Amino acid sequence: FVPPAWAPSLFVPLTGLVLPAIGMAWAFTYIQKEK
Amino acid sequence: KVKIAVDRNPVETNFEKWAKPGHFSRALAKGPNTTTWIWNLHADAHDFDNHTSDLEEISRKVFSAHFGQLGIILIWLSGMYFHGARFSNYEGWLSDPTHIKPSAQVVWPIVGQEILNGDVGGGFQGIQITSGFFQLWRASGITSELQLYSTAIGGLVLAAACFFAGWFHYHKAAPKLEWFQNVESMLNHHLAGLLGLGSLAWAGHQIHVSLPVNKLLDAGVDPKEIPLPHEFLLNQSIIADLYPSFSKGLAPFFTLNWAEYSDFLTFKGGLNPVTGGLWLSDTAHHHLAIAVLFLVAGHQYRTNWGIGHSIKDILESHKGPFTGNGHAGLYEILTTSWHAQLAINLALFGSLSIIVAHHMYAMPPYPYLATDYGTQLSLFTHHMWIGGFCVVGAGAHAAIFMVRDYDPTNNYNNLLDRVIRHRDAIISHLNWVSIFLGFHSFGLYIHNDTMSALGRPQDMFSDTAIQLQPVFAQWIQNTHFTAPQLTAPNALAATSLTWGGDVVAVGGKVAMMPIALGTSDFLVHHIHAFTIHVTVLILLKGVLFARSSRLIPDKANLGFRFPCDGPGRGGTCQVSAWDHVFLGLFWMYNSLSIVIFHFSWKMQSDVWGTVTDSGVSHITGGNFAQSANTINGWLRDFLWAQSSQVIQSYGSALSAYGLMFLGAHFVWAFSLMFLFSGRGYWQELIESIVWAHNKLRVAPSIQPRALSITQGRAVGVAHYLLGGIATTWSFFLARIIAVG
Amino acid sequence: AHVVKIYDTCIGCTQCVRACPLDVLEMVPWDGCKAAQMASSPRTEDCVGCKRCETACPTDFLSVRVYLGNESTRSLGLAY
Amino acid sequence: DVAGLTPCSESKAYNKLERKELKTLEKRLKKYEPGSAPYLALQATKERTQNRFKNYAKAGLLCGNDGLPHLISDPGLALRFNHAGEVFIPTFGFLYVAGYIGHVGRQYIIKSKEDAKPTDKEIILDVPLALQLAFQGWAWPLAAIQELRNGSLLEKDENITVSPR
Amino acid sequence: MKDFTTYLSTAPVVGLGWAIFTSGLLIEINRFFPDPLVFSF
Amino acid sequence: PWKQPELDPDTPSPIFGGSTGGLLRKAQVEEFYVTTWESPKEQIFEMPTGGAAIMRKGPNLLKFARKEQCLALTTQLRTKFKMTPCFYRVYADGKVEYLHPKDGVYPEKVNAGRVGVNQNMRSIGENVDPIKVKFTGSQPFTI
Amino acid sequence: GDFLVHHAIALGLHTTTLILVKGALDARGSKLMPDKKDFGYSFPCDGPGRGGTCDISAYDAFYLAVFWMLNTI
Amino acid sequence: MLETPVTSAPIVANYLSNLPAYRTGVAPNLRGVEIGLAHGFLLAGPFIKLGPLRNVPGAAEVVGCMSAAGLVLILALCLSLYGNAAFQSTSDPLMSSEGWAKFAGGFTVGGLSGVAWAYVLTQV
Ligand code: CLA
Ligand code: CLA
Ligand code: CLA
Ligand code: CLA
Ligand code: CLA
Ligand code: CLA
Ligand SMILES: CC1=C(C/C=C(\C)CCC[C@H](C)CCC[C@H](C)CCCC(C)C)C(=O)c2ccccc2C1=O
Ligand code: SF4
Ligand code: SF4
Ligand code: SF4
């Protein structure tokens, strides 16, 4: 239903810091992978 | 050894080569078959190094071309003096230089353009000129239009003499290669007669003509009541009661009692409070000292009488331990390659133009020059852009010399060979320092913009939040303000008012006042340093990699001016040195645009303005300390706060500026597709148009082709630079005339 | 590597080989031209695609053709 | 009164614009003595402005809500409301001059392609031939339609260079 | 003379002559007929 | 040629100081090219990787990171002094491959020994449309 | 002014259409490049030969028409 | 090939030799520990100098120290990413895969230690 008041205080940090970091780490492993 | 070597009548003065357009080169000697030939005819027209391999004929052509350019310059100067003589209000301006605007161009009433003849004052209508010719003529003692007419006639006569000299020294009496190669004689004659004797002649004119007329003008008497300069020249009574040391009559000069000449050869630094310009006696002693110094310097090189230095010996003797063969082959390089001399001349002339712009915005060496803000701004910007173009052409012709005239046999372990041998380290370090400067200046600007938009005025790099004050510049300003106090005790005041002191104002307008340097000044100065560094990087990468590289090892065989080496190695477009100069032209444009924007904002906010009883009220109210730290401040408080006069100039005499402004924007846009796109698209469009004209049997015999890739790049950069320069010219002139 | 294709319109003028900066082309004996020469590309793995051979071709259209694709260390002209 | 536009003679804003221009011209004129060249130039400018404002009137011109004259475009509407000379006749004159230029250039191209090295004649003009063709193009449409009739105006597609498909 | 005449027969010289003639014709027309906009007599 | 010459690393290098456009890390990881020639006299030439060097009277050996640099030096020596040089390619494992004079008579000549490869026996413009070769991996110019 | 800006819009539409159909109709061949079908849709150029051949593909015509479409909109 | 007095000075060679990166024989975890200690100690400074809460007494030091520790964590993550990307395939053990992984672990340990040392040094 209605998200809590700390939801903007929590969800934006993941998708702004650690979700791009995890995606960039996975993609960087994907580019340089050999067979 | 040094003697005149002249061949008699090598080229016949005939019109048979005027009928055939393409005659200097064998490629164009066969006639035209495509339209690019025409462009080639207008491209290799003055590329004398490609027409013939003989250095003597190239040197003769260079001599005659220089004579032609001098004749063109003298024609232009005579036209300026003629326009001041007839279509001008110079005599009216001499009575009240602080209320009548200088005007020397009058238009014809044809289609409503007579509104451009604005009310400049003095019962005259015309275009307000910003060249400062009025102040130059006032500094030269010119009073009536008869003197301007005589100067115009003499300039036309000298231009005809220069054109006759070019024709004669090409067709009739052409100097040989040994005549041109006497670099010691050329340097001695240029230092002693071209510069020293010219400085002495101008000092004599200032002493005997310009100083008394300027003194009487500053005294407030009528210009018609002022005696003619020949009255000062012949009868010694007027110059004696105007200057008592003239009563001695050349005695103190020969008796070494030069201190008696202290009345009309002064050292009073600063500006004359009557007119807001440099003291004429100071300029007279300056040009006298310059003449003596250059006369001394002109007797340095040995030509025909044993004594004197040798350029080759001097160059070969200066050899350090870390440089191998010290300056060994440079004497043979600069006596055989015209392009190396052209590069050196263009670099020094462009730098000299930059010094000229700086040192006549700082000290206005003309009466009533600082009061005319528009004249000072136009002169600064013009000399700035001429210097930038010349220093770009310096790198261009250095790259041309590297491609064409470089010989590896004469350059094995000399300075040029070692520079080529570590060009990669040079370019890499220059690239690194360019990146570091761009980051720590433009990122500072972006940081200020963000923290301003984020509501953090305390987090900015401003004069109130984080003071990055220019401590070195402030210390130098304080030292030069105290230069007459301890280190130059014979100077009456400071050499300029920019360091500090009181405020000199003329006619209620600020002539010169002290300039304060803050955080915004440090930011823009480091921005200018970054832009100059990047332009140096581009031009040096063009010069050093003109011959070969790891990407392209045979770039020297491709010539200086080639478009590409195909899409190979991933693509090799814009790899030539010419393309490097073409790229660096835009960077020079951006650099000098930021420089002149900083100049205009700084003098409009902290220098120029009016003087009231309360204090000095500037044009923009001194917002540069608070608005120049952000890009949005430059957008709003400099580009949007100004340029309102340009867009509202319609219906007034300034409207053409706005018209030019709009047209300039047009030209700046019209370049872009020459800068973008390519050649195959336009070639196919031209093929379709050729089909259309072939259907109606109106296809031209000369096959139309698209412009070359190098030609397209040149057209794009030329139209881009023209649009940008005209935009800045129109905006600057309209803003500085409407409110200045 | 790039693909270099040579057709029968070649006249054996050896201009494409002289313009080649990496020694990709060669001349082989032939009977389809007056000069009895035909261009060949036995070292097409060393070609970078500079199209200098196409510039030197005197025949209308092109008797030699370079097609880019599948860039390698040698095809990209890299010294590193 | 077409397109909701009042005539310039009966308009209101047209008179306001005329008075404003005369007022700023008189304000510029009052700054000079009557016996001066700028005074004569400004008086000539004022006379030219008055003559232009009078000649724009009594000619069928229409202006809407700003006093700036508007040009009636559609022929027939312009023909029946005395507006043919606004754009209908100027395009006829322009078509005449443009066809003159095109026919003269076509004649020069055709006559210059006959001789050896026509590119030399293209880049070095035959001035007597150019002036002769300049004074022979007064009947360009008759000649153009007659070459269209005999087929010499058009070239067959078999003889025209065609890009590959 | 004929070399000079062929020099004037070149394209830029005749282009300059045409431009001067056309500009002078249009300027004299606009001067002797001040501000023409409406084709009326 | 009649017998393919073998690369001799003990041949002296030309008189030259330090180099900056010379061998990078690709030389010790991938192949690098080596140009040898036989100078009849002492003369000064220009390297494609930098400034100027002086070749010794006798065998001369130079190293480059690209084959284009080797052929640029080869054509400079052939046009300037008619030197007829030759360059090898050395891999990371030490395999030496003979590159420029494959039949020893230079590719400008014919020698009646080479076999013409990668040649299309049709005229250009007679190739099939890209619709004809679709989802097959074969280009119109490769058939 | 509305009529003038509408005619300018018509100019933008016609010019963008001209660029796009020049790219599309000359996509598979042209006088400068007869074998443009063999080089695919997106290739850089053919080199400096035949006077210069940069921006000859239909992709480059599209990329110029993007500028013209941006100006029109 | 172009040797210089800058790149061939004995003093420069000795200064480069005793660094943890170019040490003769030292286990890679010790090199990582020294690297992390030095680089975290220098990185803590600019974060406590002109951080977002520089004007707040007490909060500036802790905010800058946790910012430096977080940056050290991102640097360790990127170091491990480089180790996994470059040394996935097959005589210096630091350039090996597990050697570079031990170097990254030593780097994050040393970075945290250096951040803590900077905290306890700026607190006194
Ligand atoms: C949408 C993504 C996103 C998010 C959520 C943030 C969030 C933040 N950034 Mg920003 N930033 C971003 C993208 C983002 N950034 C991008 C894309 C750029 C480049 C253009 C920047 C450039 C930037 C700069 C230049 C600065 C910030 C700063 C900040 C902080 C604002 C001030 C503050 O709250 O101090 C809170 C401060 C704390 C110490 C609270 C704890 C939060 C820390 C910083 C994260 C944890 C540290 C790390 C994991 C190591 C810790 C290890 C251990 C102690 C657990 C905040 C944490 C400022 C900052 O952090 O100061 C150093 C700062 O100066 N950011
Ligand atoms: C002291 C003697 C003297 C003087 C004053 C000059 C002056 C000049 N020389 Mg020259 N030169 C000299 C000796 C001298 N030369 C000698 C001895 C040599 C041979 C070694 C040369 C070789 C030389 C070359 C190769 C070139 C010059 C050029 C120039 C011009 C440079 C442009 C400039 O500053 O504009 C200043 C312009 C003016 C002041 C306008 C007036 C110019 C007047 C007409 C010239 C009067 C000086 C003249 C030398 C008097 C003798 C000539 C006499 C036979 C009639 C300038 C006019 C350049 C050139 O061709 O420019 C045309 C050039 O490329 N000089
Ligand atoms: C190039 C610069 C220049 C020139 C042209 C002059 C010229 C003059 N100054 Mg000045 N002066 C100068 C620089 C100059 N000065 C400088 C740098 C200073 C230092 C501050 C001074 C300080 C100064 C003072 C303090 C005074 C002058 C005075 C004079 C006059 C005296 C002339 C004289 O004795 O000289 C020597 C001149 C000659 C020997 C004449 C030259 C020889 C002639 C031309 C030979 C002609 C022969 C011919 C072939 C045959 C006839 C031809 C015919 C048949 C057609 C004269 C007008 C004095 C003055 O105004 O009183 C009158 C004066 O009181 N000057
Ligand atoms: C204003 C337009 C503009 C800008 C900003 C750039 C930017 C750049 N060009 Mg270019 N240039 C341009 C137009 C422009 N170009 C044009 C039109 C031409 C054609 C003539 C050239 C010709 C040209 C040449 C010939 C050269 C350059 C070079 C450069 C670099 C400048 C060196 C530097 O310090 O950059 C620093 C970077 C910037 C100024 C970009 C803005 C950076 C901001 C502040 C962001 C900071 C980081 C940010 C917070 C991180 C984002 C995080 C995010 C990923 C989440 C940079 C990449 C030079 C080069 O390669 O490097 C020396 C070079 O040699 N350019
Ligand atoms: C101040 C007045 C002025 C000016 C300066 C121009 C300027 C121009 N006009 Mg415009 N025009 C004007 C008024 C003006 N026009 C007026 C009042 C009308 C009538 C409403 C037109 C109608 C008009 C048309 C229809 C065309 C132009 C074209 C042109 C351009 C090239 C002319 C040319 O190729 O040279 C002179 C001409 C030649 C060298 C070749 C002759 C070609 C002409 C156009 C054919 C004439 C005969 C033809 C069979 C009649 C039917 C035309 C057809 C469209 C139906 C040029 C920018 C042409 C253009 O831009 O093409 C891209 C074009 O097609 N104009
Ligand atoms: C007099 C010669 C001549 C003639 C008869 C034509 C005729 C034509 N051209 Mg061409 N054109 C010419 C010269 C000529 N053109 C020149 C010199 C250029 C280079 C600027 C072009 C560039 C050009 C383009 C880019 C296009 C045409 C198009 C067209 C067609 C549209 C009609 C028109 O006015 O277009 C407008 C034509 C112009 C605006 C060009 C005017 C150029 C100058 C001003 C006129 C030159 C006159 C010449 C010097 C007279 C010589 C007389 C002699 C005695 C010296 C038509 C088939 C269009 C087309 O394909 O339609 C199907 C098209 O897209 N032309
Ligand atoms: C537009 C364009 C063309 C096409 C333009 C060409 C071929 C040049 C056209 C020049 C014209 C002929 C100049 C003269 C124009 C007028 C006819 C002259 C003025 C006429 C009035 C005075 C009446 C290129 O060839 C090209 C090549 C390489 C990069 C970019 C481009 C590029 O952008
Ligand atoms: S350049 Fe062309 S015609 Fe000449 S040998 Fe090569 S493929 Fe044949
Ligand atoms: S594109 Fe260049 S490297 Fe390739 S075969 Fe042609 S000329 Fe040789
Ligand atoms: S033809 Fe044009 S796009 Fe192609 S390599 Fe040359 S400059 Fe670049």
Author numbering:
A (entry chain I): 74 to 108
B (entry chain A): 12 to 751
C (entry chain C): 2 to 81
D (entry chain F): 63 to 227
E (entry chain J): 1 to 41
F (entry chain D): 51 to 193
G (entry chain B): 516 to 588
H (entry chain L): 56 to 145, 160 to 193
Task: Recite the paper's sentences.
Multisubunit Photosystem I (PSI) encompasses half of this Fe in its three Fe4S4 centers and is a target for degradation in insufficient Fe conditions, which reduces the capacity for CO2 fixation. TIDI1 (thylakoid iron deficiency induced) is an iron starvation induced chlorophyll-binding protein found in multiple green algae including Dunaliella spp. isolated from coastal Arctic waters and hypersaline ponds. PSI and PSII are each associated with LHC proteins for increased absorption cross-section, LHCA for PSI and LHCB (or LHCBM) for PSII. In this work, we report high-resolution cryoelectron microscopy (cryo-EM) structures of PSI-LHCI supercomplexes from Fe-starved compared to Fe-replete cells of both D. salina and D. tertiolecta.
The density maps were better defined around the PSI core than near the detergent belt, consistent with a higher level of flexibility in the outer regions of the complex. Three subcomplex features are evident in the structures: the PSI core, consisting of all but one of the 12 PSA subunits encoded in the genome (PsaA to PSAL1); one crescent-shaped LHCI tetramer made up of four LHCA subunits (LHCA1, LHCA8, LHCA7, and LHCA3) arranged from the PSAG1 (proximal) to the PSAK1 (distal) side; and one LHCI dimer (LHCA2 and LHCA9) on the opposite side, together accounting for all 6 LHCA proteins encoded in the genome. The poor resolution of the D. tertiolecta PSAH1 and PSAL1 subunits precludes identification of associated pigments, Chl a201, and a carotenoid of PSAH1 as well as Chl a302, Chl a305, and a carotenoid of PSAL1. Although D. tertiolecta and D. salina are separated by ~253 million years of evolution and inhabit distinct ecological niches, coastal Arctic vs. hypersaline desert, the PSI-LHCI supercomplexes from the Fe-replete condition are highly similar, underscoring the high conservation of PSI subunit organization and antenna arrangement in the Dunaliella radiation. Although we did not undertake absolute quantification of each of the subunits in the Fe-replete cells, we note that PSAG1, PSAL1, PSAH1, PSAI1, LHCA2, and LHCA9 were captured in the proteomics dataset of both species, and indeed these subunits were found in both Fe-replete structures. For both D. tertiolecta and D. salina, the arrangement of the PSI core and the inner LHCI tetramer subunits in the PSI–LHCI2 supercomplexes is almost identical to that in the PSI-LHCI1 supercomplexes.
